[PDB]
Design a protein around this ligand. Sequence first.
Ligand SMILES: CCCCCCCC/C=C/CCCCCCCC(=O)OC[C@H](COP(=O)(O)OCCN)OC(=O)CCCCCCC/C=C/CCCCCCCC
Ligand SMILES: CCCCCCCC/C=C/CCCCCCCC(=O)OC[C@H](COP(=O)(O)OCCN)OC(=O)CCCCCCC/C=C/CCCCCCCC
Ligand SMILES: CCCCCCCC/C=C/CCCCCCCC(=O)OC[C@H](COP(=O)(O)OCCN)OC(=O)CCCCCCC/C=C/CCCCCCCC
Ligand SMILES: CCCCCCCC/C=C\CCCCCCCC(=O)OC[C@H](COP(=O)(O)OCCN)OC(=O)CCCCCCC/C=C/CCCCCCCC
Ligand SMILES: CCCCCCCC/C=C\CCCCCCCC(=O)OC[C@H](COP(=O)(O)OCCN)OC(=O)CCCCCCC/C=C/CCCCCCCC
Ligand SMILES: CCCCCCCC/C=C\CCCCCCCC(=O)OC[C@H](COP(=O)(O)OCCN)OC(=O)CCCCCCC/C=C/CCCCCCCC
Ligand SMILES: CCCCCCCC/C=C\CCCCCCCC(=O)O[C@H](COC(=O)CCCCCCC/C=C/CCCCCCCC)COP(=O)(O)OCCN
Ligand SMILES: CCCCCCCC/C=C\CCCCCCCC(=O)O[C@H](COC(=O)CCCCCCC/C=C/CCCCCCCC)COP(=O)(O)OCCN
Ligand SMILES: CCCCCCCC/C=C\CCCCCCCC(=O)O[C@H](COC(=O)CCCCCCC/C=C/CCCCCCCC)COP(=O)(O)OCCN
Ligand SMILES: CC(C)CCC[C@@H](C)[C@H]1CC[C@H]2[C@@H]3CC=C4C[C@@H](O)CC[C@]4(C)[C@H]3CC[C@]12C
Ligand SMILES: CC(C)CCC[C@@H](C)[C@H]1CC[C@H]2[C@@H]3CC=C4C[C@@H](O)CC[C@]4(C)[C@H]3CC[C@]12C
Ligand SMILES: CC(C)CCC[C@@H](C)[C@H]1CC[C@H]2[C@@H]3CC=C4C[C@@H](O)CC[C@]4(C)[C@H]3CC[C@]12C
Ligand SMILES: CC(C)CCC[C@@H](C)[C@H]1CC[C@H]2[C@@H]3CC=C4C[C@@H](O)CC[C@]4(C)[C@H]3CC[C@]12C
Lengths: 240, 240, 240
Amino acid sequence: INDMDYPLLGSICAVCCVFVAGSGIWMLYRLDLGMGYSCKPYKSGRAPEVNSLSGIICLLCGTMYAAKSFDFFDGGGTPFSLNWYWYLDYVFTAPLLILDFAFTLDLPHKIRYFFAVFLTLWCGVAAFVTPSAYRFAYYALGCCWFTPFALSLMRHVKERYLVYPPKCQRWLFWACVIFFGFWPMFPILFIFSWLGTGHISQQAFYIIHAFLDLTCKSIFGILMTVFRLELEEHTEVQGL
Amino acid sequence: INDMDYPLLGSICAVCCVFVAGSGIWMLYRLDLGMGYSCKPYKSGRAPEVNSLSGIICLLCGTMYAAKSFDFFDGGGTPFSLNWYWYLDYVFTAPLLILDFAFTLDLPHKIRYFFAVFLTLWCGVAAFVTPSAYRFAYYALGCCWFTPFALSLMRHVKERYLVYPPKCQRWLFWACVIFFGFWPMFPILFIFSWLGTGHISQQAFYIIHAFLDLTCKSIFGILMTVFRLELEEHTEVQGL
Amino acid sequence: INDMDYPLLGSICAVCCVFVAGSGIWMLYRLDLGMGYSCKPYKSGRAPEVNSLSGIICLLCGTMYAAKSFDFFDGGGTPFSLNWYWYLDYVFTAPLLILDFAFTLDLPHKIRYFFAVFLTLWCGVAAFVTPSAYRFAYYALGCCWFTPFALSLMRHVKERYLVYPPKCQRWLFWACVIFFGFWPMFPILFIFSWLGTGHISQQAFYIIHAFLDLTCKSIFGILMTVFRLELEEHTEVQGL
Ligand SMILES: CCCCCCCC/C=C/CCCCCCCC(=O)OC[C@H](COP(=O)(O)OCCN)OC(=O)CCCCCCC/C=C/CCCCCCCC
Ligand SMILES: CCCCCCCC/C=C/CCCCCCCC(=O)OC[C@H](COP(=O)(O)OCCN)OC(=O)CCCCCCC/C=C/CCCCCCCC
Ligand SMILES: CCCCCCCC/C=C/CCCCCCCC(=O)OC[C@H](COP(=O)(O)OCCN)OC(=O)CCCCCCC/C=C/CCCCCCCC
Ligand SMILES: CCCCCCCC/C=C\CCCCCCCC(=O)OC[C@H](COP(=O)(O)OCCN)OC(=O)CCCCCCC/C=C/CCCCCCCC
Ligand SMILES: CCCCCCCC/C=C\CCCCCCCC(=O)OC[C@H](COP(=O)(O)OCCN)OC(=O)CCCCCCC/C=C/CCCCCCCC
Ligand SMILES: CCCCCCCC/C=C\CCCCCCCC(=O)OC[C@H](COP(=O)(O)OCCN)OC(=O)CCCCCCC/C=C/CCCCCCCC
Ligand SMILES: CCCCCCCC/C=C\CCCCCCCC(=O)O[C@H](COC(=O)CCCCCCC/C=C/CCCCCCCC)COP(=O)(O)OCCN
Ligand SMILES: CCCCCCCC/C=C\CCCCCCCC(=O)O[C@H](COC(=O)CCCCCCC/C=C/CCCCCCCC)COP(=O)(O)OCCN
Ligand SMILES: CCCCCCCC/C=C\CCCCCCCC(=O)O[C@H](COC(=O)CCCCCCC/C=C/CCCCCCCC)COP(=O)(O)OCCN
Ligand SMILES: CC(C)CCC[C@@H](C)[C@H]1CC[C@H]2[C@@H]3CC=C4C[C@@H](O)CC[C@]4(C)[C@H]3CC[C@]12C
Ligand SMILES: CC(C)CCC[C@@H](C)[C@H]1CC[C@H]2[C@@H]3CC=C4C[C@@H](O)CC[C@]4(C)[C@H]3CC[C@]12C
Ligand SMILES: CC(C)CCC[C@@H](C)[C@H]1CC[C@H]2[C@@H]3CC=C4C[C@@H](O)CC[C@]4(C)[C@H]3CC[C@]12C
Ligand SMILES: CC(C)CCC[C@@H](C)[C@H]1CC[C@H]2[C@@H]3CC=C4C[C@@H](O)CC[C@]4(C)[C@H]3CC[C@]12C
């Protein structure tokens, strides 16, 4: 029985659509202005393609929630629902975030991080659709993909959290707080959801992910964008 | 009721399969011969990977119509139909065209153009499968993705439509005629199709897209290929 | 009627999961140690991203068989089966192998090889799901994609099978034996399977592919990894 306040879920996703996509539009707006706060012709004249992943993820997530709002506003499972099959939305955005983060600090093993998160989500997608005792087997299969990735990412972050000046170090620090504080929240919610323990009802499950995706895309993307501006101001505007 | 001349639709797709794929085979045939009309060892000996997207798109589209012909020749919706779920075919080819066009003139924002068309098609794919009033909401969601992309592409084309010599400028001009004259034809057909207004029956809907895809893949790809030959003849064969 | 020894098929896939993924873990283990057998700081300190495709394919295939084991252990077609729709698993791994092989020897036409195998598998995926006389039409469509690719790959291999020293030439030779001896085995099995002639029952069909995927991913990947070590030892450790 999925009797729940669908217009409320549609309203939240509509609000999340405006904020995440609106931040994405601003995110691309500030990219093609200069190296940082000061406007510069950006050498050739075009920003690097690796510096525009943060904005597109929000727009990709912004239109993702718009489609979910249409599913929720209708009052059931639309053919193009994006909500009936869980976590299929994050299969495309989440591997872009770590790749976007990898290019920001020039982290190594960018391809490994992409497939670690791509396969973590797909294992999770398999968990929701399987209504058997092997749903936790896929979850266990997902967790043994995410855990080595999370611990390997944290290490390479600590190495790079040593040369950046304190001006841009705070922006990197808050990005990691969103990273390691809210990415592990998705597996935790699955355990306690109606699929696992049962503490969290399905209606409240959508709402938490709506706020998590604000944090993981828009707010994390804003932190990355401001971090790039401070980084390029200190290096390519100050020479140091 | 989908009572329509399926063998006619299969015959058209079979004919479209031969022409588009046949052009693609020629497209890759002329690439590995030299810089342009005159044969040159191409420096290293291999053509750049970015210069072979035009041919593969036609082969990808050529085999795409072969699968549609099998669906039409059977006389219904085959399990691997490629026609029951509309525009799922263009989700992979259309984002390759703008990326192929972007690499040809070295347009900036190549990643943004890819996702603008990738998400334009997916929003359109969502429109066909949803049999509710939100089908036009997905169409409105698709149009607000395509329109900024179309206007931003046109601008960066005008900037590059200033340095090319008139010999290769005509090839670029006709590519843009196919670009901005026939890409906007796909959204227009959706409004007037049986899903929207109802002017165009479903049987005639396949036929128009069969000719549009000839123009958008094979004919547009031929224009791009000839444009590259003239471009490289003037630059890397003449020194100017 | 699919009455077959499902726990046996689950056990084989579980065993294949451990070996392929275990080899993949070792494959990435030996990459970040040095150029070859001798440990070297690898210039910058990080291995090239193109040198880590072999390990990830095995991990991608290792987790692929784990999901199949869950489907087989359950005793039927799970919602996330990976076995009900055939060859959908290889759509992602097989195009990575030829791309991984292309980067190893710096083969040209890397993009063409990727789409040749990507479209060969998709045409094959269409063959299994279509229960009509056009299943062999998709197979014929797949074979006319694979055959030009197989013959073009063989040629460019012969050109590169001339400069490598005999120390690493044996590793390349055995990689080609796995390449041209076992990749053509997949189309051959389809003809003689229960879909085609009928010699091979469905129960025995999974088992052969389980051993083929060991050879095509783990054993082929091991051959590629050892080949890289000998190649880099002779070039970047010996100077020759
Ligand atoms: C919009 C921008 C998106 C950008 C990125 C998109 C990529 C993500 C792809 C999303 C795939 C979406 C699949 C969603 C399937 C949802 C199926 C579903 O909702 O089933 C439930 C529902 C039952 O609900 P009720 O009938 O109301 O029951 C109550 C009794 N009155 O069943 C149905 O409605 C029937 C579903 C019709 C067929 C579904 C067609 C799905 C759309 C196909 C396009 C996606 C192509 C995917 C490629 C693989 C090819 C299958
Ligand atoms: C060939 C080269 C292709 C290269 C690139 C390919 C990428 C594009 C992927 C295309 C996905 C194709 C999905 C097509 C689904 C079509 C479903 C369909 O036709 O339903 C209609 C039809 C009803 O018609 P009738 O029975 O005749 O009614 C009349 C009464 N006698 O329903 C059916 O036939 C049942 C369909 C069987 C299941 C469909 C299986 C689809 C094939 C799955 C492979 C695709 C994998 C996609 C990945 C996501 C996993 C789902
Ligand atoms: C785990 C790591 C994976 C990493 C890479 C993954 C990428 C590959 C994607 C794999 C797609 C998997 C699709 C598998 C569909 C299988 C459908 C199936 O099994 O049907 C058979 C089965 C009939 O069997 P029985 O009922 O037992 O009959 C006996 C009588 N008692 O039918 C069912 O069980 C109903 C199926 C429920 C719906 C299936 C939902 C599939 C999961 C969707 C997630 C995949 C998203 C794909 C994107 C396109 C959107 C559709
Ligand atoms: C619907 C089914 C679709 C499934 C199709 C699967 C096809 C797989 C798609 C491509 C696989 C990814 C391989 C891409 C090649 C990797 C890029 C490359 O060659 O290296 C370029 C270069 C290498 O570094 P160097 O130049 O040596 O730096 C020296 C230091 N100054 O790039 C880099 O710097 C590292 C960053 C590379 C990009 C990071 C990886 C991103 C890859 C995206 C994967 C897409 C997967 C799609 C789904 C997969 C399903 C299995
Ligand atoms: C089935 C579900 C599958 C979904 C999986 C989604 C994974 C996403 C796959 C990869 C995402 C794309 C990121 C690729 C990295 C971008 C390439 C890069 O790093 O830059 C290399 C380099 C950067 O430029 P510079 O060297 O700085 O030029 C200086 C001027 N002389 O490349 C360029 O020149 C620009 C062209 C880059 C390629 C254009 C973008 C193409 C990306 C393909 C996207 C594939 C998406 C797949 C589906 C997405 C679903 C959400
Ligand atoms: C769910 C539906 C998803 C479908 C979305 C389809 C989007 C397509 C995704 C990207 C398409 C691939 C285009 C990638 C751009 C090609 C890379 C490029 O620009 O060149 C970089 C550079 C070019 O060579 P040079 O630098 O000139 O060497 C000089 C010699 N010293 O790279 C190379 O060296 C060659 C290797 C390039 C990578 C090989 C190709 C891999 C592409 C992966 C394709 C992914 C397809 C995804 C599914 C497709 C579905 C249709
Ligand atoms: C716990 C409460 C959470 C509330 C949700 C958050 C709401 C969004 C507010 C921003 C959150 C992230 C901000 C990250 C910190 C950056 C703030 C900042 O100060 O940035 C500046 C400058 O950079 C910026 O401008 C970034 C801030 C811009 C954020 C824009 C907000 C998002 C845009 C959405 C607009 C569209 C929304 C549609 C309406 C919503 C309808 C529901 C950096 O320099 P300073 O530290 O100030 O030092 C001064 C000297 N340089
Ligand atoms: C409104 C009527 C539309 C008719 C459909 C179009 C039919 C295809 C004909 C070509 C259309 C696109 C042509 C674009 C313009 C290029 C023509 C051209 O002249 O190219 C040359 C040279 O480049 C070329 O050769 C390109 C033309 C090659 C086109 C090959 C036709 C497509 C190949 C398909 C063969 C397989 C078809 C299978 C049979 C079909 C069965 C149904 C450029 O140099 P010139 O301007 O002539 O100046 C001379 C000094 N340099
Ligand atoms: C017909 C029987 C087939 C049996 C299946 C194969 C079993 C796996 C055994 C390895 C097969 C591939 C080996 C390829 C040849 C490499 C062997 C080798 O000698 O490598 C060395 C060194 O490189 C290596 O070490 C590669 C061999 C490492 C293979 C590791 C085996 C795979 C790892 C799986 C461990 C996890 C498995 C989980 C348990 C399985 C549970 C079911 C190269 O140098 P040399 O020729 O010896 O000259 C000496 C001076 N240099
Ligand atoms: C309470 C929830 C929201 C967050 C839980 C995770 C927190 C505690 C984690 C994630 C981000 C983290 C940081 C990651 C990186 C570094 C750099 C290192 O050289 C010093 C510690 C340090 C600074 C971390 C300390 C604690 C940290 C804040
Ligand atoms: C009638 C249908 C087929 C086509 C409709 C769109 C037409 C009118 C558009 C698309 C291609 C276009 C061109 C795009 C680029 C340029 C370069 C600019 O510096 C002068 C005008 C100019 C040359 C355009 C004029 C008109 C144009 C031909
Ligand atoms: C968002 C900006 C860029 C505008 C682009 C979206 C436009 C073109 C879309 C959104 C609203 C649309 C309408 C949605 C609903 C209908 C009812 C249908 O039976 C006839 C066409 C019709 C009337 C549409 C035609 C075009 C339309 C105006
Ligand atoms: C019997 C099954 C397993 C394998 C069938 C295919 C075999 C016969 C093929 C695939 C790998 C092949 C090799 C591919 C490349 C070369 C390099 C060339 O300069 C000499 C011959 C040579 C060395 C081949 C000879 C035969 C070969 C071994």
